[PDB]
Design a protein around this ligand. Structure first.
Ligand SMILES: O=C(O)CNC(=O)C(=O)O
Ligand SMILES: [Mn+2]
Lengths: 17, 223, 13
């Protein structure tokens, strides 16, 4: 239900701080 | 004119504010000159047809435009003609660094690319939702608005947050040079009310290291 | 420069 509404993001190549 | 240093802004405002309310607004974050440069870069990206329809985590709707009506692009920050967006992202990262693990118990080690989003009026918005409903790693949402002299009574476009444990909802106008932080999880359901003018914003999501680690799993079995 | 802590808006300048 809630997952169907959430904004998509890439699941890879996160920027590291 | 005389902006608070980032270290003081973070330790004496952002941290106590986020821990008390779970929402934090900083107006006049970078100043008019830098903010206008950012507006120029966003308008250049938009004018070149580079934006795509906003997508959902799990595609379960007939059309994605039923839920969110924005068009977006993902900016790494080093692209040509995106230098001021990279400066915005590094400033956001500097604030998060200054917070030194004092945002709840989160250990923030990474973030997403920048999502440059445009709601092109015509009543487009984003229905009420939670950014990270089921532990995909996002702990803090960080949004920078770009809309000078935005009059919600005429253009709509208000970000309404519904924080858990609060009597009232919180209306955020998408003002030029405004920075917004809020917890990405179920404590902050939120919606973009229909916009009737072109509304621009730049979002970044910061990751909690442990939850984000658990989100990235490959099943070499069938499951 | 002053923050009413029941609010969540602050001008950096
Ligand atoms: O642009 C805004 O005010 C907020 N947008 C969102 O809630 C989103 O893209 O997930
Ligand atoms: Mn959202």
């Amino acid at each position: 239900d809630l997952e169907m509404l959430a904004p998509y993001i890439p699941m890879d190549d996160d920027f590291q701080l | 004119t005389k902006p608070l240093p980032a270290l003081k802004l973070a330790l004496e405002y952002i941290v106590p504010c986020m821990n008390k309310h779970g929402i934090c607004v900083v107006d006049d974050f970078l100043g008019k000159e830098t903010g206008q440069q950012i507006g120029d870069e966003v308008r250049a990206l938009h004018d070149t047809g580079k934006f795509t329809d906003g997508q959902l985590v799990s595609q379960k709707s007939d059309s994605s435009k039923d839920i969110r009506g924005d068009k977006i692009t993902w900016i790494e920050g080093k692209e040509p003609g995106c230098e001021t967006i990279g400066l915005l992202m590094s400033s956001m990262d500097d604030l998060i660094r200054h917070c030194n693990g004092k945002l709840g118990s989160y250990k923030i080690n990474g973030r997403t690319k920048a999502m440059v989003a445009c709601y092109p009026g015509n009543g487009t918005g984003y229905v009420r939702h939670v950014d990270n409903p089921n532990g995909d790693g996002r702990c803090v949402t960080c949004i920078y608005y770009l809309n000078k002299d935005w009059d919600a009574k005429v253009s709509g476009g208000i970000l309404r947050i519904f924080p858990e444990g609060k009597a009232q909802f919180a209306d955020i106008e998408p003002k030029f040079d405004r920075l917004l932080f809020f917890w990405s999880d179920r404590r902050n359901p939120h919606e973009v009310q229909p916009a009737y003018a072109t509304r621009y914003a730049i979002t970044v999501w910061y990751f909690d290291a442990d939850e984000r680690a658990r989100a990235k799993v490959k099943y070499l079995t069938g499951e | 420069x002053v923050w009413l802590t029941d609010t969540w808006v602050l001008s950096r300048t």
